Each structure stands twice: as structure tokens, then as C-alpha cells.
Subunit: 116 residues, 2 copies
């Protein structure tokens, strides 16, 4: 059900559909998750279509870190003071919902262990 | 001191043993002794970053390196059906050790939400 190799996240990057965008720069986009599982729950995605962390290249390393820096900066500016959890899901067992790499950040409540 | 003053610093300095999966000049991956999945390991930076919240912008390629090392270790441990990578920040995130780590869990179906 993805005849272009593309995803909903590609449409969001291209501004073809609305999203609750928190932050954007040249290489990533942060936005609120449309199905939140915590009072604060957002995504940081690369604009580069990396389908899953398992196929990320070594040269994508600083881009992946950039997602995490952007993530912690957005967390601070969404009022998360007491902490949060960053998550990357890979594949079926990881519960990956979209085949475009995404760092989820969840907070505003106590996150529990195990993490799923 | 190289590696900081946490349990993770002792592991980095080889003062206490761990089942190490991978090591280089920047990081160290090893199995969690309280696994929450058939496969459960940690990737830690050798640089003592106490919390992702106080990482510097400079730390970006090091943080990405943790994630690349994570996915490479996952592949080498046979996690072909998938896995979850987690970074815990602060009290609400369930951070216990004030040295940042990326946890990787697999070998079972992970559930949503992630805690």
C-alpha cells in the first residue's frame, strides 16, 4: 500500500498534509505524534528517506545524532523538566509503524519499565 | 577520570566485568544484566555525558555513533525481526544511572506504548 516507496512522513515533509510542526531545519522535522501515548509525544524525522535504522549508513551518523539533539531541544521547549524517553523502533518486533526513520520522544508522565 | 564516576565509568575502565559486544575509542556496547527481552544490551559513550538533556551540540556525531553501533550490534546478535532502541532521561524517563546510554531490546514482540 506504498506504490511510490514513499510514506505519510514524506507527505508531511513536503507539506502536502498538515501536521503539528514543532521545529524544522534543513535536515530534519519535529512534529507532534497524531496518536499520542503521553501528555507530550512527538517525532523527530530526517528529511532524508532512511526507511529504518537497520539500513542507515555510517555517513548518516551525525544526522542521526542531530535527531537526538533536536529532540532534547524540543523537549526543553515543550516544558519537559522531569524527564522523557526517546525511542527508535526497528521492524516488526520493534513495533515500527512507518518505514521512515523516526525518533519518538515521550514525556509528561512517568514512563514505565520495561519500555514495551 | 576517564569514563566518569558512575557504574558505567567502572565498566569503561574495565574495573568491573561486562559481556562486551563491541568497543572502539568512542563507545562500548554490552549486555544488560537485568534483560527485559531475550536480547537486551546498552551502548554507552566513553565520554561522560550525564544526561541527553545536557549534551552539547558538538556531541551530535558521538550520539549518532551510539545508534550506528547499536544497529550493527543488533544485526550481529541476530535480531533480524526487529528491535527497540531507548534513551531514558531523568525521573519520568526512568533514568537510574547518570551516564547516557542507548538500550537495545529485541527477540520478542515489543508493545506500544514504550512504557
Amino acid at each position: 500500500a506504498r506504490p511510490g516507496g514513499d510514506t505519510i512522513f514524506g507527505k508531511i515533509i513536503r507539506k502536502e498534509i498538515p501536521a503539528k510542526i514543532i521545529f524544522e531545519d534543513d535536515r530534519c522535522l519535529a512534529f507532534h505524534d497524531i496518536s499520542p501515548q503521553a501528555p507530550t509525544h512527538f517525532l523527530v524525522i530526517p528529511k532524508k528517506h532512511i526507511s529504518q535504522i537497520s539500513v542507515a549508513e555510517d555517513d548518516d551518523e551525525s544526522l542521526l545524532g542531530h535527531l537526538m539533539i533536536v529532540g532534547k531541544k524540543c523537549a526543553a521547549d515543550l516544558g519537559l523538566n522531569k524527564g522523557y524517553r526517546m525511542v527508535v523502533n526497528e521492524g516488526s518486533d520493534g513495533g515500527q509503524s512507518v518505514y521512515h526513520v523516526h525518533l519518538a520522544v515521550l514525556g509528561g508522565r512517568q514512563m514505565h519499565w520495561p519500555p514495551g
